[PDB]
Amino acid sequence: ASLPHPKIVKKHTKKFKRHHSDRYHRVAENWRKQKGIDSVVRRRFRGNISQPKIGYGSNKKTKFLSPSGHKTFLVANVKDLETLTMHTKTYAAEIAHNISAKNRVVILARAKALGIKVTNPKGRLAL
Template identity: 60%
Template sequence: MVSAKKHVPIVKKRTYNVHRCLAAKDDPCFSRFETTRLLGTKGMKELMSTTRFNRHQSDRFKCLSASWRKPKGIDNRVRRRFRGTMAMPSIGFGSNKKTRYMMPSGHKSFLVNNVKDVELLMMHNRTYAAEIASAVSSRKRIDIIARAKQLGVKVTNAKAKVTTEV
């Protein structure tokens, strides 16, 4: 007589999503450069992408701008979260912690008012990019840009108030 086989549960091998794997909290070696190496610049932008929330009925009426406003009506289907209606912004839609506040270049913005502020970025030139404040004069801008070039710091608005139109 043949004995019945013991029931052996089938264990599926866990496959990780690329984005989930990259955003793993337990990975101490994760860095922006590793992300771009794995996914390329297009993948970096994909990691940084955010959902656009439009105002309810902004597509119906021209007088309503598309910028998000929370619906407050007593019968509003979006506020009541009916199926098939647009999603309301919530904490779950927050951007990836690794790419939060990051520009498409992969740097985080740092506001600079003088040459001394640029020197703060000397050791962090791969993480932060200098952004010259709007109130800085064109003469000081030239000094800031020159110092940033020496230190290898990226300046996001290097051409502002420095170049002239022809």
């Protein structure tokens, strides 16, 4: 149970692909601004791809929030998790990718006793 918040609207749920990204393998999918003179994207013709701009911004009430309602926070050890004791309903713990298996059982045993939500409890389960 997190803080009460309104309905989160992203206003663009789609990843921005670059113009001519799926046609050439040399062109990555990261959005980079087309700065030509005969572009069909810079001049914004109809039926083409949309450009990301400041109108696509999310509400500040619903900014940096997961669909659970909490914010994310990378947790390395126990000392980096005890700071979130009085803020369990706002932030959520997230065990880092380079954490060994002997320390993930320690972090999950500590956040359970403190009520801090861990976003990745299924990481490196010996099953």
